[PDB]
Design a protein around this nucleic acid. Structure first.
Length: 104
RNA sequence: ACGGAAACCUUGAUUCUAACGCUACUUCUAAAUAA
């Protein structure tokens, strides 16, 4: 993810709701396991330590993500997800079908 | 110059009539956490 970053409000919410202090651990099949067997499996190589845990849940429907910015050639700030992009949209696909009995 | 000679245990008769390999059932559910 380069077009976006973690929002500061979500980071603060995760910080002092203390969700990182209540991690859950999973094995290679994604089944919940205690930290002791997670450590055992990671040491023996039967678990990938990277993608095998979760940071509980942040309460409150907060947006996880904000747009990330960059510098233009003018030295101005600009969102990374906006720009020249491309140009191919056509108009639509008008499929006629002026006979369907539309229910009220 | 045999208690001997001549005599088919033979004739016809469907192991046949009726009966659903049948009943319910979406090749389908879950996307966390991190960035």
């Amino acid at each position: 993810m380069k077009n976006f970053k973690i929002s500061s409000t979500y980071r603060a919410a995760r910080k002092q709701q203390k969700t990182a202090n209540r991690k859950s651990f999973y094995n290679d099949e994604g089944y919940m396991i205690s930290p002791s067997e997670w450590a055992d499996g990671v040491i023996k190589g039967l678990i990938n330590p990277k993608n095998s845990w979760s940071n509980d849940h942040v309460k409150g429907y907060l947006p996880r993500v904000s747009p990330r910015s960059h510098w233009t050639k003018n030295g101005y700030r600009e969102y990374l997800g906006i720009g020249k992009s491309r140009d191919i949209p056509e108009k639509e696909p008008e499929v006629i079908e002026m006979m369907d009995l539309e229910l009220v």
